[PDB]
Amino acid sequence: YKKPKLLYCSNGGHFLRILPDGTVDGTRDRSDQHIQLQLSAESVGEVYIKSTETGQYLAMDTDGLLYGSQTPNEECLFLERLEENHYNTYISKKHAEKNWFVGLKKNGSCKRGPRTHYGQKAILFLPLPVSSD
């Protein structure tokens, strides 16, 4: 798909990637096959991140492991907001007690569950918007 928001994870510095099977990870370059993830707003803050083309819903599960659902469901339902100087943050509206964040492990893979929070850069995502969607 026509590449939208190049969500650079602030830890290590990979772009957020979502793979055919459903899973999610870090790829160092926006040029990758599968970085076309778009935030489908539920409302004035809350969003479902979908693979534009292949359709998988970027989801955080019951421990807090990151994956891709078939459907938009609360695991995929992120409260968005900008924290650092134009750096976005997708907080699980399901896990809204602990308030987990879909960050990446240094190497370029998903960071799981229940200490993803306001301390590491890992939670911060810098979008480079290529397409205006």
Rounded CA separation 56/68 (Å): 5
In what side-by-side order are the strands of the sheet with 109-110?
104-105, 109-110, 24-27, 15-18, 5-9, 125-129
Rounded CA separation 53/91 (Å): 24
Rounded CA separation 52/61 (Å): 21
Report the number of distinct structural domains present in the chain: 1
Rounded CA separation 123/108 (Å): 13
Cα-Cα end-to-end distance for the chain: 12
Which range of residues forms the domain containing residue 63?
A: 1-133
Rounded CA separation 66/54 (Å): 17
CATH of the domain at 128: 2.80.10.50
Burial class (CB in 10 A: 0-12, 13-18, 19+), 118: exposed
From residue 105, alpha-carbon distances to 43, 66, 111 in Å are 29, 11, 5
How many alpha carbons fall within 13 Å on the CB side of residue 62? Answer: 0
Rg (CA), the chain: 13
The answer to whether the annotation marks 11 as part of a ligand binding site is: yes
